[PDB]
């Protein structure tokens, strides 16, 4: 299997630097062409920089002179040295392989998030949301989880550590004066819960936050 994995995304202050790396697997780098493509928070794709099988360098205009790309055909690692970061640089960064003189991006990684901002790193509060009273006396029940007041992206959320994945809606975070808030609902049969356990699992790496909240039946 062809595979590319990006690491090193982080939150960086304006004017600062960051290295991104990408490991190739299932193939060798020498031959193919290799690049970083990015997607902005407005969902625009922008090619960032490329390097050909021959070590030729290609840059986009906005990044020529700040960023540098490089590869290690021994270890099979593509690098991107970012300098003088601007807010416009905020994006998820994807590394991708091309087949020289054929195809620009035939293999894409999962991406690594980069945030360029003076907002400070804030850990989320995680709240467990049990039904009222009516949303609880029927074929099905719906539970939620509120994740409030974090920065930056991303967070991870699962239920029952990922074993519970059907019936789930996890909502894209929204940003508010420098804090993100996000939510998730999960809907299971009335004979699932509370008879078994349902737990919200939240991870926010930038704050080293790993936390779990169990849905407990409400009502005083």
């Amino acid at each position: 299997e062809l595979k590319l994995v990006e690491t090193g995304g982080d939150l960086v202050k304006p004017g600062g630097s960051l290295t991104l790396s990408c490991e190739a697997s299932g193939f060798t780098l020498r031959t193919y062409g290799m690049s970083w493509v990015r997607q902005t928070p407005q969902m625009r794709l922008e090619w960032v920089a490329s390097i050909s099988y021959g070590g030729l360098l290609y840059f986009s205009d906005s990044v020529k002179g700040r960023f540098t790309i490089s590869r290690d055909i021994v270890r099979n690692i593509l690098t991107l040295q970012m300098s003088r970061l601007r807010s416009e640089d905020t994006a998820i960064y994807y590394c991708a392989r091309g087949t020289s003189f054929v195809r620009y991006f035939d293999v894409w990684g999962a991406g690594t998030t980069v945030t360029v901002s003076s907002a400070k790193t804030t850990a989320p509060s995680v709240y467990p949301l049990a039904p009222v009273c009516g949303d609880t006396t029927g074929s099905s029940v719906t539970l939620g989880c509120l994740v409030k007041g974090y920065f930056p992206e991303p967070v991870t959320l699962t239920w029952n550590s990922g074993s519970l994945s059907s019936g789930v809606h996890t909502f894209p975070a929204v940003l508010q004066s420098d804090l993100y808030t996000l939510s998730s609902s999960v809907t299971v049969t009335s004979s699932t819960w509370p008879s078994q356990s349902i737990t919200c699992n939240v991870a926010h790496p930038a704050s080293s936050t790993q936390v779990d909240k169990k849905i407990v039946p409400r009502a005083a």
Binding site: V37, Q39, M43, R44, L45, E46, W47, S50, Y58, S60, D61, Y94, F101, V102, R103, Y104, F105, D106, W108, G109, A110, G111, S125, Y127, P128, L129, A130, P131, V132, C133, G134, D135, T142, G144, L146, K148, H169, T170, F171, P172, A173, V174, Q176, T181, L182, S183, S185, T187, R218
Partner: protein
């Protein structure tokens, strides 16, 4: 810079139908070496983009039959025969002919399915949050169609517009519906000052306001 104008910005289609997506370029886009490096990419919700067509019309192996690439000059078309639900997402064109390389702005392909009503549920602030002086009431409006939906919060009958956070999932490829989240946050002290809390929605599947509520009792 070669610009790439995608047309349509949003493409609603019922399942079974065919979808065409167009991309026009501001200038010719033949590489000196004679190739036309024009590509089509698709990004599914939650996933990375992936290649569909390269060099104008070569489908990437792995890619389903029903996707074809065509055109020349400055006019290019991606066609979808027999739209499925797993085809939903963002479609992008790209040219690698003239530096600096460029992407089109994208076209959101949306499924067109039968109307379906939201399932609404509402949540009082949790004990932990009250403890901290905060009060967030939550409302999910789940699995509905179409996307357009209106939600208002009422406190003790009277509407409340401030401190409301809204958020929508991407279209579910599994049932082609949308879901929504709506959060009203206040202070503890403010929350305790009133008794009734309602999540009020208008959507086309009801002639009536869809209402969920509770009392801090």
């Amino acid at each position: 810079d070669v610009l790439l104008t995608q047309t349509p910005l949003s493409l609603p289609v019922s399942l079974g139908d065919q979808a065409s997506i167009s991309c026009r370029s501001s200038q010719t886009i033949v590489h000196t070496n004679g190739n036309t490096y024009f590509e089509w990419y698709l990004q599914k919700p939650g996933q990375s983009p992936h290649l569909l067509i390269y060099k104008v019309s070569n489908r990437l192996s792995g890619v389903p039959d029903r996707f074809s690439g065509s055109g020349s000059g400055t006019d290019f078309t991606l066609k979808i025969s027999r739209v499925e639900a797993e085809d939903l997402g963002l479609y992008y064109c790209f040219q690698g002919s003239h530096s600096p390389w460029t992407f089109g702005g994208g076209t959101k392909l949306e499924l067109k399915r039968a109307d379906a009503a939201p399932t609404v549920s509402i949540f009082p602030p949790s004990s932990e949050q009250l403890t901290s002086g905060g009060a967030s009431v939550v409302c999910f409006l789940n699995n509905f169609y179409p996307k357009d939906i209106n939600v208002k919060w009422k406190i003790d009958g009277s509407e409340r517009q401030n401190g409301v956070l809204n958020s929508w999932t991407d279209q579910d490829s599994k049932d082609s519906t949308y879901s929504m989240s709506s959060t009203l946050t206040l202070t503890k002290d403010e929350y305790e000052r009133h008794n009734s809390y309602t999540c009020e929605a208008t959507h086309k599947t009801s002639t009536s306001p869809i209402v969920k509520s509770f009392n801090r009792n």
